[PDB]
RNA sequence: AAUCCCCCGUGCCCAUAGCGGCGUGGAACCACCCGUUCCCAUUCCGAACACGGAAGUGAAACGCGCCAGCGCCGAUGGUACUGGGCGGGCGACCGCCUGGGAGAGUAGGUCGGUGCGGGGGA
RNA sequence: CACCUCGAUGUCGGCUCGUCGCAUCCUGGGGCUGAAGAAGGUCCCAAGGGUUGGGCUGUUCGCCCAUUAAAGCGGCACGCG
RNA sequence: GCGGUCGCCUCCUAAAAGGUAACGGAGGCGCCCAAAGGUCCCCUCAGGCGGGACGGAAAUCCGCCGGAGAGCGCAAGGGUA
RNA sequence: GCGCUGACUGGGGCCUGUAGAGCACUGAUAGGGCUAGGGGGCCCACCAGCCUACCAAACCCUGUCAAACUCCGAAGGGUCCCAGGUGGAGCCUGGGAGUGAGGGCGCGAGCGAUAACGUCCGCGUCCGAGCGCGGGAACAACCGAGACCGCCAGCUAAGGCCCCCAAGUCUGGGCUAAGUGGUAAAGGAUGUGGCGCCGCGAAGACAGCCAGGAUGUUGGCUUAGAAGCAGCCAUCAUUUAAAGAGUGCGUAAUAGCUCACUGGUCGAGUGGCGCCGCGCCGAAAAUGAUCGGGGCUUAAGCCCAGCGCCGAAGCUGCGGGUCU
RNA sequence: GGUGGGGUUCCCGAGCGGCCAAAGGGAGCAGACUGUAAAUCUGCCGUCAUCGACUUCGAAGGUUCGAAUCCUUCCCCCACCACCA
């Protein structure tokens, strides 16, 4: 016999909303691990590290090199 | 000493095609220049066999020229080991960095009957101008005995230019 | 030594201030000035300045503070400016820059 | 019989034998090279049969080179068969090898002396191999 | 007002701005510096943080330059691989078409650029 | 492995009756021999025919007795209820 | 049947969204902390080298170099000066 | 009921960490150098202590490997926007189900043995339900193609065009002599055709034939004798266009014989290597054989280029049916 | 027949790949003790020879620089496997 067999449930990461999408406050934005993309304006960021609009808006990402990914809402949406 | 082949011009023409042809496909570089150039295959293996990225192959080709090109790389495809792709390099007067050939000249110079040859680069890397091209090095060395390791300064050194360094590193010991 | 404790706090300070996404009050103190500027990021551009350099007062640094701190207030009031947030960079609030800062009333408040 | 001290982990998935590739392939130590013609796993009680096949051709002498080297497990199934439970018992090693890698690759023996060993080395083979000597194409490096 | 150059802030690009070596700056700014009464301080120490200063020095720090030993960036050609279409081999696997096309490596490149506001020069 | 057969494809061994294969046990023909002869060894050709009787065990097989040119090995639903 | 297993977390398998199987490869949980919680204020590692009584490979001290390889209560992953 | 939103496609953004590759991390890892620790061999036993043809830290040169490594990273894939797209498309509400044993094949993995008409997932397809049609001898799932009905009409697909058997004994060019085709591998071979590379050669080579076939000498060693051929070696030296103290037969050791190596004869090629095409060996199973069969050899086989024709329930032509 | 483990000087016996002619015990020879012995203690323990030289791990051959120690091979053992329904 097998002392192996194991494995939990896949967690459905990643992100819920690409560049130039149009959410509304309150939208998850990114679902992720640690903090590989950072809060941008107007996104909050929740206490398992997870990404949402502060505003209706759409939806900018932006790569700031050692400083990270951030995502933006960008308002009037 | 002389080493002259051939080239030829190429824009479009797949290289697969070229490949299929005989003729062996590269290109043609330098700090003021790069064009896409082709050679026959058996002509540059005769010649290649012999220059090697050690001596300055002058090309020639159309409109014709004599460009002083070192071969900076071959590609040869692993499955057959046969060159599908090389690039020439032409030299024009700025140092420059490449591969001399040395030649160990002498007995065992040193702990004979018996100690070990062991030589550690067949080759060295110098900068060096285009004009004066030290076609080989002259090591000699009567000792070399047990313990004593060759580094840099310890070798010629052509009246031609100075090394690429770094001057600590081992050519021959005998151990 | 990479990245030493002043330009830490430094940014430490300066990151918080810049998410809550209000106006900028910087400060540089020096030896002997005591700098101010109101800057909007995002137009990455000064809006209103102030120091004891420009206005060529000296006697007392501490005085002198709050006299460049009644004076960014009235300048920078004077272009509809008010609410911002106060940054203090690498400074303990505290002295000169406490008194810019609580002499910086009369406009540009909640300091 | 070669084999890795301390592995990572024991049994690795069988995975594929494509593309002939990635590096070895340019004869960088020695006089002389055998070379890969087709792919296969090479084991370790090969390698060591082709070891011994060519140090005995040189009477103990010259130097031999190997430059394969059998860091993936093996495991097999006891005899008893059958499917399940688990996966189970490492036998030996492999090298993968795919085409165009030097394998072996003599040095400091006479020319028409080292392609006889070689010879008799990659009769030692699973697959196709190649005898080859060295070149201005092995550049310098 | 503008244009320029130098400094002080403060952003942006996020190493082509970095390490190292050399050189250079004190009028002004900045630093170190002079003190520790006072505010306020260091699990001990005004080191730091803080205040009051202004004799000295640009030694340290910083700013500005220069050098390619390192670091970092890096083609063009050519391959690998591959979306779609076809073949071949007992097999492991291979090949052709059409479109896309790396990585390493070669040539090279770089000792930053730039915005807003100050202070000073013209 | 689980593909036909669980609204049934009777299962070992023996006996009877064979037929086929040849990787040949014997007989026939060969090469090599570390083949003097005789007698072997090994390998090649060859499936025409042959290939014993007993003790023990349900046995196949094996061991053993006495012989023999030899006491062949397989397949045919481990051939054939 | 016997053996193993049965819910939860981490990684791989998983074919660069998500999801994805096998008695596929490996590990972990069934707790814990009144501070290991909120906030404000400071502080920045491991490691290497040189120095220094009892001090040793490492107790504490000083110098320099060290961009994170340390730490984050516990498995792994992601994250993080 | 809504009614242009659909699959698919164009452009644009964003997301990702696989193929490939890489070694910067985690590990593994070949050769070398330089070096802590050390096995030690030992110099002393006080710190000492020189060498490593063993381990082996770090470090540097060279060289690799990895599902649970990644400094890198394609093609693609996903999602939103804007456009095309009127489709037995799409969305909303409801009524009725059936299904929840799948299978083969391709591709990508795992398990297995780089076994299975094996097993387990992924993306695709077909069978299922297209065991209706054509091709594949026959044959669910391979190639062709989606059968509404009728016709003694046409064009094609796949595959075919010597006869069984509809259409070429078609036209060029080349290869193979095995009946290969009508196959099974390592590995082997003056098979045969081609493209090379190297050596030697009219200072006349390769092949034969004519001629010479050392001497100190038994070489010493061993020896009744090895005086090359019972044999372990110093295989050294001379004179020569030139014979190895000698390769084999011989052998009472010798005698005798041959070879090597040269001279000459003659007269144009010769020997080595690598590559490609087709073939040969390797090649033994059980009721009677066979490529589907006859039969085929400048092909009726294989490669290259052509031109025609045959060929389905596909497509067309004519008539008809039903639904929309 | 097939795979698990075993052969150590005359006997039992320990054994790491750098030491292994191989320590540890009994034999077995020599000395001392004793009137002489047995027991006990001492030295010798394959051969010489000063050290050290030299072959021994059942026989052989490999691997390694080095093998009693790893690798097969011919034996030589008792723990285990071979119909079948
Ligand atoms: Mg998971
Ligand atoms: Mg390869
Ligand atoms: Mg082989
Ligand atoms: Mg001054
Ligand atoms: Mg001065
Ligand atoms: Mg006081
Ligand atoms: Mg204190
Ligand atoms: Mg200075
Ligand atoms: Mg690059
Ligand atoms: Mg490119
Ligand atoms: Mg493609
Ligand atoms: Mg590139
Ligand atoms: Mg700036
Ligand atoms: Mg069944
Ligand atoms: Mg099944
Ligand atoms: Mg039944
Ligand atoms: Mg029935
Ligand atoms: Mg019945
Ligand atoms: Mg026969
Ligand atoms: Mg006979
Ligand atoms: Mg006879
Ligand atoms: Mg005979
Ligand atoms: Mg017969
Ligand atoms: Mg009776
Ligand atoms: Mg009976
Ligand atoms: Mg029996
Ligand atoms: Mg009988
Ligand atoms: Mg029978
Ligand atoms: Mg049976
Ligand atoms: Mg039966
Ligand atoms: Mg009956
Ligand atoms: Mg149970
Ligand atoms: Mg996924
Ligand atoms: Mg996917
Ligand atoms: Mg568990
Ligand atoms: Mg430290
Ligand atoms: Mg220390
Ligand atoms: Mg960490
Ligand atoms: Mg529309
Ligand atoms: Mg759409
Ligand atoms: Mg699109
Ligand atoms: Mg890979
Ligand atoms: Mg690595
Ligand atoms: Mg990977
Ligand atoms: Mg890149
Ligand atoms: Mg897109
Ligand atoms: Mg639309
Ligand atoms: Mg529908
Ligand atoms: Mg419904
Ligand atoms: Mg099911
Ligand atoms: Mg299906
Ligand atoms: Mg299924
Ligand atoms: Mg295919
Ligand atoms: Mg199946
Ligand atoms: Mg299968
Ligand atoms: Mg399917
Ligand atoms: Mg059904
Ligand atoms: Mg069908
Ligand atoms: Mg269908
Ligand atoms: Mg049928
Ligand atoms: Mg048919
Ligand atoms: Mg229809
Ligand atoms: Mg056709
Ligand atoms: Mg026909
Ligand atoms: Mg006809
Ligand atoms: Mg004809
Ligand atoms: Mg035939
Ligand atoms: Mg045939
Ligand atoms: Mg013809
Ligand atoms: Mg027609
Ligand atoms: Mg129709
Ligand atoms: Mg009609
Ligand atoms: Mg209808
Ligand atoms: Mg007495």
Known sequence: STRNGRDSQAKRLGVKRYEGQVVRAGNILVRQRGTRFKPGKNVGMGRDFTLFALVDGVVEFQDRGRLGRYVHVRPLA | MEYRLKAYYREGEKPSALRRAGKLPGVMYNRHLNRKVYVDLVEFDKVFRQASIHHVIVLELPDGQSLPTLVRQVNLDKRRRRPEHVDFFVLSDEPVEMYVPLRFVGTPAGVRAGGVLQEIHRDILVKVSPRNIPEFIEVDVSGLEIGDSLHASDLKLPPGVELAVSPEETIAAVV | ?111 | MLMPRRMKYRKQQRGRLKGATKGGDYVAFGDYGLVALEPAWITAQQIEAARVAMVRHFRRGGKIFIRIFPDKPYTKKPLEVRMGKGKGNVEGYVAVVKPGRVMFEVAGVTEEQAMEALRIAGHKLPIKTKIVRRDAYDEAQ
């Open chain 3, 1 to 111: 030594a990479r990245l030493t404790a002043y330009e830490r706090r430094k940014f430490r300070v300066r990151n918080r201030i810049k998410r809550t996404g209000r106006l900028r009050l910087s400060v540089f103190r020096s030896l002997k000035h005591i700098y101010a500027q109101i800057i909007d990021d995002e137009k990455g551009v000064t809006l209103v300045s102030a120091s004891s350099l420009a206005l060529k007062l000296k006697g007392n640094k501490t005085e002198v503070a709050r006299q460049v701190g009644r004076a960014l207030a009235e300048k920078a009031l004077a272009l509809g400016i008010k609410q911002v947030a106060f940054d203090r960079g690498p400074y303990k609030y505290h002295g000169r820059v406490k008194a810019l800062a609580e002499g910086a009333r009369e406009g540009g408040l909640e300091f």
